[PDB]
Amino acid sequence: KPKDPIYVWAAADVNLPGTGRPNKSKPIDDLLAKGYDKGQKPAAEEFNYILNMSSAWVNWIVNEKFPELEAEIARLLAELENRINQQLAV
Amino acid sequence: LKDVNHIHPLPDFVRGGFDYVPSDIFSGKENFEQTLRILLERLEFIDQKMVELAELRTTLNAEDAILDEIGRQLGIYRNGLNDPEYRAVIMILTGNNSKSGTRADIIATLKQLFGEDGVTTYKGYNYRLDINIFNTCMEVTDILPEIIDMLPLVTHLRVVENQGY
């Protein structure tokens, strides 16, 4: 298992001092469809955005989705048992 | 061997004319010379300013106070541009009138704004074109509108600027 907590990249949403523009931006769809080439060069915004999206979704999967799915699993069984046992007592 | 532009300050203007004193009759009298020198030296100042009246009116050296007049004749208004880049836009728009937006052509126009190695251009399959800047000496957002104008009708453009490679 992974040994360390999962940090987000460029978590904050602020204007960078060097640029004065938001630290993250969506890459243009055309670039997503194909990616970089020899001559083409990466921009800071897209670079930060990709890693930020990856880390944020990893958080949402690990620390959010599984815990609540487990809680729902337990709750479903508890409610089913209650419903059945009511009739059984009847 | 000789400059074609004859508009220059007259070399040694002062000693000329003094050469027309007939036979040194007055030379060494220190009374007539001063009277003549005082009058002639006034023409020196006027003679000098005759050049700047022509030199300074060229678009290369024109100051902002009058550069606006040059731009006004061409329809390129100052808007919010400042002097160093207002000169650039004037050159860019004027140069656009004899262009065809070819790959070799586009490199030439960008050459005057970023030195020799300050710019490079990548090309893409579906109308994609890219511009790279390495040694910008002026703020680019205000120059951007023109950079679009000299491109084909259907170009797809990205702009990225950085210092150095």
Query: Is the distance from CB of B121 to CB of B107 less than 8 angstroms?
Result: yes
Q: Distance between CA atoms of A4 and B119, rounded to whole angstroms? A: 43
What angle (nearest 5°) sits at the alpha carbon of residue B55, between those of residues B51 and B60?
A: 170
Q: Distance between CA atoms of B115 and B122, rounded to whole angstroms? A: 18
Which of chain B's residues have a Cβ under 8 Å away from the Cβ of A39?
A: 120, 122-123, 130
Query: Is the distance from CB of B106 to CB of B123 less than 8 angstroms?
Result: no
The half-sphere exposure of A32 on its side-chain side, counting CA atoms within 13 A, is 8
Assess A19–B contact: CB distance below 8 Å, yes or no.
no
CB contact under 8 A, B156 and A39: no
Q: Distance between CA atoms of A77 and B30, rounded to whole angstroms? A: 124
How does DSSP assign chain B, residue by residue?
---S---SPPTTTTHHHHTTSSSSSSTT-SSHHHHHHHHHHHHHHHHHHHHHHHHTTSTTT--HHHHHHHHHHHT---TT--HHHHHHHHHHHHHGGG----HHHHHHHHHTTSTTTSEEEEE-SSSEEEEEESS--S-STTTHHHHHHTS-TT-EEEEEE-S--
Closest residue on chain B to A35 (Cα): B124
CA distance, residue B46 to nearest chain A CA (Å): 51
Q: Distance between CA atoms of A9 and A51, rounded to whole angstroms? A: 6
Technique used to solve these coordinates: cryo-EM
From B160, B96, B155, select the one nearest B128 (Cα to Cα).
Answer: B155
Q: Distance between CA atoms of B1 and A37, rounded to whole angstroms? A: 53
CB contact under 8 A, A40 and B156: no
Does residue A90 sit in helix, strand or coil? coil
For residue A67, give the amino acid letter.
Answer: P
Which of chain B's residues have a Cβ under 8 Å away from the Cβ of A40?
A: 122, 124, 130
Q: Distance between CA atoms of B99 and A74, rounded to whole angstroms? A: 73
Q: Is the dihedral of CA A31, A36, A41, A47 positive or negative?
A: positive
